[PDB]
């Protein structure tokens, strides 16, 4: 349950260590963004020679959450830090890679590049 | 002295009508199948109690 003012340990090679979720991109007045949704995020920490910089307000897909993603099959995945992938504005990843695990809700959310590019889609 | 206060004196009518439901209910009394005193029900009152009841002063 990412909401505004969340920090998100960014997982890709863009230049972002941590992004703060500015505004969730769901409908009109959406409360939270769970996994697989698009947030808007302002980059607060910097890989030094990064593509993005400390301040580039950029959209991001949420790939991990501390809150339990109750899948329809009864089980629930739960990660151990909120994570986001920086996303170019056509809903496509910005970095060449992505670090550890993502949730597999991203395939039906429409983030198949992340699910191909992530080393363990749990 | 303060914020919530009676705007007017409640007269005899509304006072003695609000004191309607404060009429006391008469207590319930049943006649104790050993000897005829009026215990309340389910009550080991000072005659014998129930059959073979816990006694005040009796055999």
């Amino acid at each position: 349950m990412i909401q505004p003012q969340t920090y998100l340990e960014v997982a890709d090679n863009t230049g972002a260590r941590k992004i703060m979720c500015i505004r969730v991109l769901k409908g009109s007045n959406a409360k939270y963004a769970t996994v697989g949704d698009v947030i808007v995020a302002s980059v607060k920490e910097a890989i030094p020679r990064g593509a993005v910089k400390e301040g580039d307000v950029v959209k991001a897909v949420v790939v991990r959450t501390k809150k339990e993603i109750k899948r329809p099959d009864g089980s629930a995945i739960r990660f151990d830090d909120n994570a986001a992938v920086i996303i170019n504005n056509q809903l496509e990843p910005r970095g060449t890679r992505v670090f550890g695990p993502v949730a597999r809700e991203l395939r039906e959310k429409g983030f198949m590049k992340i699910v191909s590019l992530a080393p363990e889609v749990l | 002295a303060k914020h919530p206060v009676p705007k007017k004196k409640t007269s005899k009518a509304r006072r003695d009508a609000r004191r309607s439901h404060h009429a006391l209910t008469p207590p319930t009394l049943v006649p104790c199948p050993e000897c005829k005193a009026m215990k309340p029900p389910h009550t080991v009152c000072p005659e014998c109690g129930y059959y073979a009841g816990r006694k005040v002063l009796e055999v």
Partner: protein, 137 residues
Amino acid sequence: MNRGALIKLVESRYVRTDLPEFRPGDTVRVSYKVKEGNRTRIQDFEGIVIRIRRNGFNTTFTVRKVSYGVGVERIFPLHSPLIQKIDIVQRGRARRAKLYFIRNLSDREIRRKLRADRKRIDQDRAAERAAKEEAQK
């Protein structure tokens, strides 16, 4: 009527008494992971098993591995179509029933605190029905 949960257990023909009855030791095996148009996707799962909350049916147990940079917990229903859920080391010895203490520490203290359930790892190994007494009598 008078059997308000005997109804609820007789209704549960969905039960699966074929999984191992583990304590919070270490279960590592498959799940269902149906995706991509094809069902037959049998992704394993490593990990210490943290909690086993029970309700008779639908006892849903949590298994936490630390995958690739971070922790990940998964709360499996235990009576779904999980194929196999065999455990690598019936271990721990596990004073705590529901062991959420491996969240704050995520390190060699896991090794130092889920040390050895040598009792159960001896007896559920010496429950080897793996002799060569078949096809003779």
